mmCIF file of N, CA and C in Angstrom:
data_model
loop_
_atom_site.group_PDB
_atom_site.id
_atom_site.type_symbol
_atom_site.label_atom_id
_atom_site.label_comp_id
_atom_site.label_asym_id
_atom_site.label_seq_id
_atom_site.Cartn_x
_atom_site.Cartn_y
_atom_site.Cartn_z
ATOM 1 N N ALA L 1 60.889 -43.555 -3.917
ATOM 2 C CA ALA L 1 59.555 -44.141 -3.999
ATOM 3 C C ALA L 1 58.501 -43.209 -3.404
ATOM 4 N N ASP L 2 58.850 -42.490 -2.330
ATOM 5 C CA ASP L 2 57.940 -41.482 -1.785
ATOM 6 C C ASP L 2 57.711 -40.342 -2.771
ATOM 7 N N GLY L 3 58.762 -39.940 -3.488
ATOM 8 C CA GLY L 3 58.596 -38.931 -4.520
ATOM 9 C C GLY L 3 57.724 -39.404 -5.668
ATOM 10 N N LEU L 4 57.845 -40.685 -6.034
ATOM 11 C CA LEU L 4 56.974 -41.251 -7.061
ATOM 12 C C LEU L 4 55.520 -41.280 -6.606
ATOM 13 N N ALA L 5 55.288 -41.534 -5.315
ATOM 14 C CA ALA L 5 53.924 -41.517 -4.785
ATOM 15 C C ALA L 5 53.334 -40.110 -4.810
ATOM 16 N N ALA L 6 54.136 -39.113 -4.424
ATOM 17 C CA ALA L 6 53.669 -37.728 -4.449
ATOM 18 C C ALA L 6 53.388 -37.265 -5.876
ATOM 19 N N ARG L 7 54.217 -37.706 -6.830
ATOM 20 C CA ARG L 7 53.976 -37.411 -8.240
ATOM 21 C C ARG L 7 52.689 -38.068 -8.728
ATOM 22 N N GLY L 8 52.438 -39.302 -8.289
ATOM 23 C CA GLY L 8 51.238 -39.995 -8.715
ATOM 24 C C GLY L 8 49.959 -39.436 -8.121
ATOM 25 N N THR L 9 50.051 -38.749 -6.981
ATOM 26 C CA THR L 9 48.833 -38.295 -6.312
ATOM 27 C C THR L 9 48.530 -36.804 -6.463
ATOM 28 N N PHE L 10 49.554 -35.944 -6.547
ATOM 29 C CA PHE L 10 49.301 -34.507 -6.470
ATOM 30 C C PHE L 10 48.626 -33.963 -7.722
ATOM 31 N N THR L 11 48.777 -34.653 -8.856
ATOM 32 C CA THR L 11 48.090 -34.241 -10.077
ATOM 33 C C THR L 11 46.579 -34.363 -9.930
ATOM 34 N N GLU L 12 46.106 -35.499 -9.416
ATOM 35 C CA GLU L 12 44.680 -35.675 -9.180
ATOM 36 C C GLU L 12 44.178 -34.799 -8.043
ATOM 37 N N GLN L 13 45.028 -34.535 -7.041
ATOM 38 C CA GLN L 13 44.640 -33.609 -5.978
ATOM 39 C C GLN L 13 44.410 -32.197 -6.513
ATOM 40 N N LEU L 14 45.317 -31.706 -7.358
ATOM 41 C CA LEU L 14 45.128 -30.367 -7.903
ATOM 42 C C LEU L 14 44.049 -30.344 -8.977
ATOM 43 N N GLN L 15 43.766 -31.491 -9.603
ATOM 44 C CA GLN L 15 42.615 -31.573 -10.497
ATOM 45 C C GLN L 15 41.312 -31.385 -9.732
ATOM 46 N N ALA L 16 41.193 -32.047 -8.577
ATOM 47 C CA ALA L 16 40.025 -31.871 -7.720
ATOM 48 C C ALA L 16 39.930 -30.440 -7.204
ATOM 49 N N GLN L 17 41.075 -29.846 -6.855
ATOM 50 C CA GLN L 17 41.089 -28.461 -6.390
ATOM 51 C C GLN L 17 40.674 -27.480 -7.480
ATOM 52 N N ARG L 18 41.132 -27.696 -8.713
ATOM 53 C CA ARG L 18 40.780 -26.799 -9.808
ATOM 54 C C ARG L 18 39.305 -26.926 -10.169
ATOM 55 N N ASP L 19 38.757 -28.143 -10.092
ATOM 56 C CA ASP L 19 37.324 -28.311 -10.323
ATOM 57 C C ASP L 19 36.502 -27.657 -9.218
ATOM 58 N N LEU L 20 37.010 -27.687 -7.983
ATOM 59 C CA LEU L 20 36.334 -27.014 -6.878
ATOM 60 C C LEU L 20 36.330 -25.500 -7.068
ATOM 61 N N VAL L 21 37.451 -24.948 -7.538
ATOM 62 C CA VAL L 21 37.528 -23.508 -7.788
ATOM 63 C C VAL L 21 36.631 -23.120 -8.961
ATOM 64 N N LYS L 22 36.515 -24.004 -9.960
ATOM 65 C CA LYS L 22 35.594 -23.770 -11.073
ATOM 66 C C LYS L 22 34.142 -23.742 -10.604
ATOM 67 N N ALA L 23 33.780 -24.655 -9.699
ATOM 68 C CA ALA L 23 32.420 -24.680 -9.174
ATOM 69 C C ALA L 23 32.126 -23.438 -8.342
ATOM 70 N N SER L 24 33.108 -22.991 -7.550
ATOM 71 C CA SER L 24 32.941 -21.750 -6.794
ATOM 72 C C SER L 24 32.831 -20.536 -7.710
ATOM 73 N N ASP L 25 33.522 -20.556 -8.851
ATOM 74 C CA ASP L 25 33.440 -19.437 -9.786
ATOM 75 C C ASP L 25 32.085 -19.383 -10.476
ATOM 76 N N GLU L 26 31.539 -20.545 -10.850
ATOM 77 C CA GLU L 26 30.200 -20.568 -11.436
ATOM 78 C C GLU L 26 29.147 -20.154 -10.417
ATOM 79 N N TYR L 27 29.341 -20.548 -9.153
ATOM 80 C CA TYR L 27 28.473 -20.102 -8.068
ATOM 81 C C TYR L 27 28.512 -18.587 -7.916
ATOM 82 N N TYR L 28 29.711 -18.002 -8.001
ATOM 83 C CA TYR L 28 29.840 -16.555 -7.871
ATOM 84 C C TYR L 28 29.217 -15.830 -9.056
ATOM 85 N N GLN L 29 29.331 -16.405 -10.257
ATOM 86 C CA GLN L 29 28.717 -15.789 -11.432
ATOM 87 C C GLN L 29 27.197 -15.816 -11.346
ATOM 88 N N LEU L 30 26.631 -16.929 -10.869
ATOM 89 C CA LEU L 30 25.183 -17.005 -10.713
ATOM 90 C C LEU L 30 24.690 -16.066 -9.620
ATOM 91 N N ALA L 31 25.456 -15.933 -8.531
ATOM 92 C CA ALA L 31 25.080 -14.991 -7.482
ATOM 93 C C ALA L 31 25.179 -13.551 -7.966
ATOM 94 N N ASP L 32 26.141 -13.266 -8.846
ATOM 95 C CA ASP L 32 26.264 -11.918 -9.391
ATOM 96 C C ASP L 32 25.122 -11.596 -10.345
ATOM 97 N N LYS L 33 24.695 -12.576 -11.147
ATOM 98 C CA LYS L 33 23.541 -12.366 -12.021
ATOM 99 C C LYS L 33 22.270 -12.169 -11.207
ATOM 100 N N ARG L 34 22.119 -12.950 -10.134
ATOM 101 C CA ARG L 34 20.979 -12.796 -9.240
ATOM 102 C C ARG L 34 20.991 -11.449 -8.533
ATOM 103 N N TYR L 35 22.174 -10.922 -8.223
ATOM 104 C CA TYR L 35 22.249 -9.615 -7.583
ATOM 105 C C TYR L 35 21.952 -8.497 -8.571
ATOM 106 N N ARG L 36 22.470 -8.608 -9.794
ATOM 107 C CA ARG L 36 22.292 -7.528 -10.756
ATOM 108 C C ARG L 36 20.888 -7.524 -11.341
ATOM 109 N N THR L 37 20.161 -8.638 -11.232
ATOM 110 C CA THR L 37 18.741 -8.591 -11.561
ATOM 111 C C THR L 37 17.958 -7.847 -10.487
ATOM 112 N N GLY L 38 18.325 -8.029 -9.223
ATOM 113 C CA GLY L 38 17.675 -7.348 -8.117
ATOM 114 C C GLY L 38 16.992 -8.267 -7.131
ATOM 115 N N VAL L 39 17.238 -9.570 -7.191
ATOM 116 C CA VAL L 39 16.543 -10.521 -6.335
ATOM 117 C C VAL L 39 17.122 -10.539 -4.928
ATOM 118 N N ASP L 40 18.442 -10.550 -4.798
ATOM 119 C CA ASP L 40 19.072 -10.630 -3.491
ATOM 120 C C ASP L 40 20.077 -9.499 -3.295
ATOM 121 N N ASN L 41 20.458 -9.294 -2.040
ATOM 122 C CA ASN L 41 21.222 -8.130 -1.628
ATOM 123 C C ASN L 41 22.719 -8.356 -1.813
ATOM 124 N N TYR L 42 23.501 -7.438 -1.242
ATOM 125 C CA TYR L 42 24.948 -7.456 -1.413
ATOM 126 C C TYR L 42 25.613 -8.441 -0.457
ATOM 127 N N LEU L 43 24.911 -8.837 0.611
ATOM 128 C CA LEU L 43 25.473 -9.749 1.607
ATOM 129 C C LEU L 43 25.709 -11.138 1.026
ATOM 130 N N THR L 44 24.696 -11.689 0.363
ATOM 131 C CA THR L 44 24.830 -13.012 -0.221
ATOM 132 C C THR L 44 25.554 -12.984 -1.559
ATOM 133 N N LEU L 45 25.917 -11.803 -2.052
ATOM 134 C CA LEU L 45 26.946 -11.731 -3.079
ATOM 135 C C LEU L 45 28.331 -11.787 -2.449
ATOM 136 N N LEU L 46 28.495 -11.101 -1.316
ATOM 137 C CA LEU L 46 29.799 -10.989 -0.675
ATOM 138 C C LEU L 46 30.264 -12.315 -0.094
ATOM 139 N N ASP L 47 29.343 -13.131 0.423
ATOM 140 C CA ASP L 47 29.788 -14.398 1.006
ATOM 141 C C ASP L 47 30.217 -15.389 -0.078
ATOM 142 N N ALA L 48 29.559 -15.343 -1.239
ATOM 143 C CA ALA L 48 29.983 -16.168 -2.365
ATOM 144 C C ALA L 48 31.311 -15.677 -2.929
ATOM 145 N N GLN L 49 31.510 -14.352 -2.932
ATOM 146 C CA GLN L 49 32.806 -13.787 -3.299
ATOM 147 C C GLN L 49 33.899 -14.249 -2.345
ATOM 148 N N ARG L 50 33.566 -14.357 -1.060
ATOM 149 C CA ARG L 50 34.501 -14.859 -0.062
ATOM 150 C C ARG L 50 34.845 -16.322 -0.315
ATOM 151 N N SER L 51 33.823 -17.125 -0.628
ATOM 152 C CA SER L 51 34.019 -18.544 -0.913
ATOM 153 C C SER L 51 34.896 -18.766 -2.135
ATOM 154 N N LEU L 52 34.779 -17.890 -3.135
ATOM 155 C CA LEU L 52 35.599 -17.947 -4.343
ATOM 156 C C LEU L 52 37.102 -17.896 -4.070
ATOM 157 N N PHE L 53 37.585 -16.817 -3.454
ATOM 158 C CA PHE L 53 39.025 -16.797 -3.260
ATOM 159 C C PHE L 53 39.490 -17.626 -2.073
ATOM 160 N N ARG Q 1 -29.217 13.905 17.187
ATOM 161 C CA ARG Q 1 -29.540 14.703 16.014
ATOM 162 C C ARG Q 1 -29.003 16.112 16.200
ATOM 163 N N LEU Q 2 -28.317 16.627 15.182
ATOM 164 C CA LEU Q 2 -27.601 17.884 15.346
ATOM 165 C C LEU Q 2 -27.967 18.904 14.271
ATOM 166 N N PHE Q 3 -29.145 18.775 13.669
ATOM 167 C CA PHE Q 3 -29.672 19.822 12.806
ATOM 168 C C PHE Q 3 -30.998 20.312 13.361
ATOM 169 N N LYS Q 4 -31.258 21.603 13.197
ATOM 170 C CA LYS Q 4 -32.586 22.126 13.474
ATOM 171 C C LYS Q 4 -33.522 21.724 12.343
ATOM 172 N N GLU Q 5 -34.710 21.248 12.698
ATOM 173 C CA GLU Q 5 -35.621 20.708 11.701
ATOM 174 C C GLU Q 5 -36.264 21.818 10.880
ATOM 175 N N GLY Q 6 -36.568 21.495 9.627
ATOM 176 C CA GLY Q 6 -37.205 22.446 8.742
ATOM 177 C C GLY Q 6 -36.319 23.567 8.261
ATOM 178 N N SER Q 7 -35.007 23.399 8.319
ATOM 179 C CA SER Q 7 -34.074 24.419 7.873
ATOM 180 C C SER Q 7 -33.379 23.983 6.590
ATOM 181 N N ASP Q 8 -32.614 24.906 6.024
ATOM 182 C CA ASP Q 8 -31.823 24.641 4.834
ATOM 183 C C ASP Q 8 -30.444 24.154 5.246
ATOM 184 N N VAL Q 9 -29.982 23.092 4.597
ATOM 185 C CA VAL Q 9 -28.695 22.486 4.897
ATOM 186 C C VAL Q 9 -27.877 22.425 3.619
ATOM 187 N N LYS Q 10 -26.563 22.509 3.764
ATOM 188 C CA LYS Q 10 -25.663 22.390 2.632
ATOM 189 C C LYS Q 10 -25.169 20.956 2.504
ATOM 190 N N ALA Q 11 -24.585 20.652 1.348
ATOM 191 C CA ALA Q 11 -24.070 19.314 1.108
ATOM 192 C C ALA Q 11 -22.827 19.065 1.949
ATOM 193 N N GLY Q 12 -22.743 17.862 2.512
ATOM 194 C CA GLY Q 12 -21.666 17.508 3.405
ATOM 195 C C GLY Q 12 -21.896 17.849 4.858
ATOM 196 N N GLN Q 13 -22.962 18.580 5.177
ATOM 197 C CA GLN Q 13 -23.264 18.902 6.563
ATOM 198 C C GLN Q 13 -23.747 17.663 7.302
ATOM 199 N N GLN Q 14 -23.160 17.420 8.471
ATOM 200 C CA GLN Q 14 -23.516 16.275 9.294
ATOM 201 C C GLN Q 14 -24.945 16.403 9.808
ATOM 202 N N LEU Q 15 -25.625 15.264 9.923
ATOM 203 C CA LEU Q 15 -26.990 15.224 10.430
ATOM 204 C C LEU Q 15 -27.111 14.437 11.722
ATOM 205 N N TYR Q 16 -26.636 13.196 11.750
ATOM 206 C CA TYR Q 16 -26.694 12.374 12.946
ATOM 207 C C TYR Q 16 -25.364 11.672 13.170
ATOM 208 N N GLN Q 17 -25.101 11.382 14.440
ATOM 209 C CA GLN Q 17 -24.033 10.492 14.866
ATOM 210 C C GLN Q 17 -24.654 9.157 15.250
ATOM 211 N N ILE Q 18 -24.105 8.064 14.729
ATOM 212 C CA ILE Q 18 -24.730 6.761 14.908
ATOM 213 C C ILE Q 18 -23.882 5.847 15.801
ATOM 214 N N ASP Q 19 -23.157 6.428 16.785
ATOM 215 C CA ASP Q 19 -22.463 5.725 17.871
ATOM 216 C C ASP Q 19 -21.508 4.653 17.362
ATOM 217 N N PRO Q 20 -20.319 5.031 16.846
ATOM 218 C CA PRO Q 20 -19.518 4.092 16.041
ATOM 219 C C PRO Q 20 -19.072 2.822 16.752
ATOM 220 N N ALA Q 21 -18.187 2.928 17.746
ATOM 221 C CA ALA Q 21 -17.938 1.941 18.801
ATOM 222 C C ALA Q 21 -17.443 0.564 18.350
ATOM 223 N N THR Q 22 -17.519 0.263 17.060
ATOM 224 C CA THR Q 22 -16.975 -0.893 16.362
ATOM 225 C C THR Q 22 -16.063 -0.453 15.238
ATOM 226 N N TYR Q 23 -16.500 0.543 14.466
ATOM 227 C CA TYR Q 23 -15.687 1.080 13.389
ATOM 228 C C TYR Q 23 -14.493 1.831 13.944
ATOM 229 N N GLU Q 24 -14.657 2.448 15.115
ATOM 230 C CA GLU Q 24 -13.525 3.040 15.818
ATOM 231 C C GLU Q 24 -12.505 1.978 16.207
ATOM 232 N N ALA Q 25 -12.980 0.801 16.615
ATOM 233 C CA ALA Q 25 -12.083 -0.278 17.012
ATOM 234 C C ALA Q 25 -11.320 -0.837 15.817
ATOM 235 N N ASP Q 26 -12.022 -1.111 14.714
ATOM 236 C CA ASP Q 26 -11.305 -1.652 13.560
ATOM 237 C C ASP Q 26 -10.457 -0.585 12.875
ATOM 238 N N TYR Q 27 -10.816 0.690 13.035
ATOM 239 C CA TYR Q 27 -9.961 1.768 12.560
ATOM 240 C C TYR Q 27 -8.683 1.853 13.376
ATOM 241 N N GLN Q 28 -8.787 1.650 14.692
ATOM 242 C CA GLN Q 28 -7.593 1.619 15.531
ATOM 243 C C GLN Q 28 -6.712 0.425 15.191
ATOM 244 N N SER Q 29 -7.324 -0.710 14.848
ATOM 245 C CA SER Q 29 -6.541 -1.881 14.454
ATOM 246 C C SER Q 29 -5.828 -1.651 13.124
ATOM 247 N N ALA Q 30 -6.528 -1.051 12.157
ATOM 248 C CA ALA Q 30 -5.919 -0.786 10.856
ATOM 249 C C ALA Q 30 -4.817 0.258 10.961
ATOM 250 N N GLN Q 31 -5.005 1.266 11.815
ATOM 251 C CA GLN Q 31 -3.958 2.263 12.008
ATOM 252 C C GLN Q 31 -2.770 1.678 12.758
ATOM 253 N N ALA Q 32 -3.021 0.715 13.648
ATOM 254 C CA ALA Q 32 -1.929 0.034 14.331
ATOM 255 C C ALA Q 32 -1.115 -0.815 13.366
ATOM 256 N N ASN Q 33 -1.777 -1.436 12.389
ATOM 257 C CA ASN Q 33 -1.040 -2.170 11.364
ATOM 258 C C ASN Q 33 -0.275 -1.217 10.450
ATOM 259 N N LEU Q 34 -0.868 -0.054 10.166
ATOM 260 C CA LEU Q 34 -0.226 0.930 9.301
ATOM 261 C C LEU Q 34 1.023 1.508 9.950
ATOM 262 N N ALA Q 35 0.980 1.714 11.271
ATOM 263 C CA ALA Q 35 2.116 2.291 11.984
ATOM 264 C C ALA Q 35 3.323 1.364 11.988
ATOM 265 N N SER Q 36 3.105 0.063 11.812
ATOM 266 C CA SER Q 36 4.223 -0.854 11.639
ATOM 267 C C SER Q 36 4.704 -0.869 10.197
ATOM 268 N N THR Q 37 3.770 -1.022 9.250
ATOM 269 C CA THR Q 37 4.206 -1.307 7.889
ATOM 270 C C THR Q 37 4.780 -0.069 7.204
ATOM 271 N N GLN Q 38 4.385 1.140 7.628
ATOM 272 C CA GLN Q 38 4.927 2.321 6.964
ATOM 273 C C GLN Q 38 6.356 2.596 7.413
ATOM 274 N N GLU Q 39 6.686 2.294 8.671
ATOM 275 C CA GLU Q 39 8.062 2.504 9.088
ATOM 276 C C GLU Q 39 8.950 1.369 8.611
ATOM 277 N N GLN Q 40 8.387 0.171 8.414
ATOM 278 C CA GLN Q 40 9.154 -0.871 7.735
ATOM 279 C C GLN Q 40 9.448 -0.481 6.291
ATOM 280 N N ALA Q 41 8.467 0.120 5.608
ATOM 281 C CA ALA Q 41 8.680 0.565 4.235
ATOM 282 C C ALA Q 41 9.687 1.704 4.164
ATOM 283 N N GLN Q 42 9.669 2.603 5.150
ATOM 284 C CA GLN Q 42 10.632 3.701 5.169
ATOM 285 C C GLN Q 42 12.046 3.205 5.454
ATOM 286 N N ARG Q 43 12.188 2.229 6.357
ATOM 287 C CA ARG Q 43 13.506 1.673 6.639
ATOM 288 C C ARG Q 43 14.050 0.901 5.444
ATOM 289 N N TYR Q 44 13.178 0.192 4.724
ATOM 290 C CA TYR Q 44 13.628 -0.499 3.521
ATOM 291 C C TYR Q 44 13.936 0.481 2.397
ATOM 292 N N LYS Q 45 13.239 1.618 2.362
ATOM 293 C CA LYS Q 45 13.555 2.663 1.394
ATOM 294 C C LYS Q 45 14.919 3.271 1.677
ATOM 295 N N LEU Q 46 15.247 3.450 2.956
ATOM 296 C CA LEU Q 46 16.567 3.959 3.314
ATOM 297 C C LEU Q 46 17.657 2.938 3.016
ATOM 298 N N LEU Q 47 17.376 1.655 3.240
ATOM 299 C CA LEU Q 47 18.417 0.644 3.100
ATOM 300 C C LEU Q 47 18.577 0.149 1.670
ATOM 301 N N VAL Q 48 17.600 0.399 0.797
ATOM 302 C CA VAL Q 48 17.693 -0.120 -0.562
ATOM 303 C C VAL Q 48 18.649 0.708 -1.414
ATOM 304 N N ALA Q 49 19.008 1.913 -0.963
ATOM 305 C CA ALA Q 49 19.908 2.752 -1.746
ATOM 306 C C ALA Q 49 21.337 2.229 -1.693
ATOM 307 N N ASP Q 50 21.755 1.714 -0.541
ATOM 308 C CA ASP Q 50 23.094 1.168 -0.373
ATOM 309 C C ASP Q 50 23.178 -0.309 -0.724
ATOM 310 N N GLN Q 51 22.109 -0.877 -1.290
ATOM 311 C CA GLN Q 51 21.960 -2.294 -1.630
ATOM 312 C C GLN Q 51 22.144 -3.219 -0.434
ATOM 313 N N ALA Q 52 21.853 -2.741 0.777
ATOM 314 C CA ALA Q 52 21.870 -3.620 1.937
ATOM 315 C C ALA Q 52 20.668 -4.548 1.936
#
């Protein structure tokens, strides 16, 4: 029964985790576009890169 | 007055000093602002090459 509970919950947990990683990836892409335009420096690109992985 | 009267003078030759005493002060203020902003511009010129 504990295994059935873990099966019932870990799918939605990793769904939330994958959506979080997707949001961090879109954040990193927007920060990279903002950096390559020339608006902000390499520091606030690097911290978003850190948040990604 | 620093010219001899009734003489020939060339263009650009000074004639009188009119005791500046205010323009010297605002010139010192403008140069004091320049001494900050030009070294800020030079430091940003040095740092913009490495994208810092």
